[PDB]
């Protein structure tokens, strides 16, 4: 029971710096490769 008390600690400090929206939500490279994933020739 040692990693629960710090992972709950690490997620509390993370929620102060928040909401980037413009470029930090997606990238042009990863979203374009996703088009190949849901194409009829992909997965």
């Amino acid at each position: 029971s040692q990693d629960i008390i710090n992972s709950f600690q690490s997620i509390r400090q993370e929620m102060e710096a928040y909401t980037p929206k413009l470029t930090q939500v997606l990238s042009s490279s990863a979203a374009s490769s996703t088009i190949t994933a849901l194409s009829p020739g992909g997965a």
Binding site: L22, L26, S28, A31, S32, I35, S39, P40
Partner: protein, 386 residues
Amino acid sequence: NLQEFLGGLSPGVLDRLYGHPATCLAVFRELPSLAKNWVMRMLFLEQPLPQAAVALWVKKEFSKAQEESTGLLSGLRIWHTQLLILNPIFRQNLRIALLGGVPSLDKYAEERWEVVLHFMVGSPSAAVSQDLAQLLSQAGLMKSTEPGEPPCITSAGFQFLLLDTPAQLWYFMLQYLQTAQSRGMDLVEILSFLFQLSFSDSLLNFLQHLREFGLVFQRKRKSRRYYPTRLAINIVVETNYRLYAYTESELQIALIALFSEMLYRFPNMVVAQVTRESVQQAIASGITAQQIIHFLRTRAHPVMLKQTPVLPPTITDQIRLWELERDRLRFTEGVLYNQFLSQVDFELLLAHARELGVLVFENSAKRLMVVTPAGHSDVKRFWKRQ
């Protein structure tokens, strides 16, 4: 319609039309069913996907809705071929809309818009503003044909009264925008101002025209900023032909009297009746029965908007069946020619008759060919000169 107007437009103004909160959200809000999905799919893309992909993203069933969507979606010039990457002016400003980059307001709007509609009826409390009378007559719903102490109301003005309250305003701005190119300002800044109102120096003069119909509220005689109203967002009927109307506004009563007849008038209720001799009194000017049914379905009572289909079906085709008594004996003009013993020449004349688009009726026994008198002056030349 909105996309009817933007379809007949040059690309030289649509690129400067796309402001960040106003226009890119407005054109995106009117895209039919599936065009809204493709714009959101390639909103975050940068490399153009191949052209054969979007044909295969739909089923074989409902494949006809694919081309009419992209026919509009390329008609407004949102993407192009590029070899379908979107417009860089459109993709940038729409991404701004995804977080990028007081009862006095309402009661003023209804009483200021009602006096605009009272100008189209006979009333001494008319909208006394000479700029609006010349605005309506060039739009084509206030016939004068004289100087005139009153202005008359033509057949198109009768159809304007029974249009919906958002839908009659879009027909009104489209005639404001179509004539403002030579008397007002550029089309770009006035159209993007309406869409920014939906959510220079010459633009203050356009604001004082919206002050007359009621979409802004000044309240202190042309201050710095305005106050938008609820107009700037964009009764029962029985089996025995009676309609009871819980309104008391004098405009809404005379709109019932166009196609009904009054028989009592209490406070807060008016009972009228849809009869044969009163619908045909309205159709004879032309307020035709597809507009009467749409008038009562948008203005219906909450107790009518229940588990039954609204406007119960006995009364919704009896108004249609009373329209078709005018539909008998459709007159049309023509000129005849006959009395030829040649049994090939009436067949020979068919090769010289159909290609102008002037023939009306065809016969096979005696073969009466009838031509309009606008196209009769040249068919008489062919008969005498072989």
